[PDB]
Design a protein around this ligand. Structure first.
Ligand code: NI
Length: 221
């Protein structure tokens, strides 16, 4: 029953604030991104690198800390795979969804370690811009679903006023997960109320999040 429907996906972005747009880059490109990502991750996990851009929380006792983000991803040492961040299809996808020219404003690798991943608390990425003005492209380097720690969102919430309290919005709902296959690109409005659950299961969830913005938009506060 599956389909590929870019126009409907843009419509769902406009209406619900998020959409899975399916594959954007050739599978081989996704594969290299994944490899680059893992090389970034193993430095933390296996070789013991600790830096400001490697966001982690500590666990009680024996455990090594849990890595959940690599910040400033475009600055990190992982050329030549890093160059793939700047494939033209990505910004063109974002420009289409948001219906105007865009410039990337932030690059991150977000991560669910196997077994130990925490949730990401509900939030809105930005509210100092109008709806359909700044979006995040989530390039999924893994299969992700509900009990894996995939993205969850409240449909329509990107349209709520700036002063909307995220907790009343989450408690209201509805809350809908966003299942993805490796290669999928999810695009969501920065105003969207969204989070992700914990990863208690044994798989990674690795995602490259790039923020694209109307160049006339004020910067992140
Ligand atoms: Ni977010």
């Amino acid at each position: 029953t599956a389909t590929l429907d870019r126009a409907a996906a843009i419509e769902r972005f406009r209406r619900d604030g998020f959409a899975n747009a399916g594959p954007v880059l050739a599978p081989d490109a996704i594969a290299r991104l994944k490899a680059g990502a893992e090389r970034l991750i193993t430095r933390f996990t296996d070789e013991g690198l600790r830096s400001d851009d490697y966001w982690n929380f500590p666990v009680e006792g024996d455990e090594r800390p849990v890595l959940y983000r690599v910040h400033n991803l475009e600055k990190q040492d992982w050329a030549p795979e890093r160059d793939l961040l700047h494939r033209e299809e990505l910004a063109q996808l974002a420009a289409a969804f948001v219906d105007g020219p865009v410039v990337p404003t932030a690059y991150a690798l977000v991560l669910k370690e196997p077994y130990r991943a925490a949730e990401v608390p509900w939030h809105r990425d930005r509210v100092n811009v109008g709806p359909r003005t700044v979006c995040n492209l989530s390039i999924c380097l893994d299969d992700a679903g509900p009990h894996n720690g995939c993205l969850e969102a409240v449909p329509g919430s990107h349209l709520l006023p700036d002063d909307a309290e995220v907790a009343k919005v989450r408690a209201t709902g509805p809350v809908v997960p966003v299942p993805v296959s490796q290669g999928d690109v999810v695009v969501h409005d920065v105003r969207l109320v969204h989070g992700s659950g914990p990863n208690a299961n044994g798989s990674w969830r690795r995602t490259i999040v790039i923020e694209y913005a109307d160049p006339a938009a004020p910067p992140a506060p």
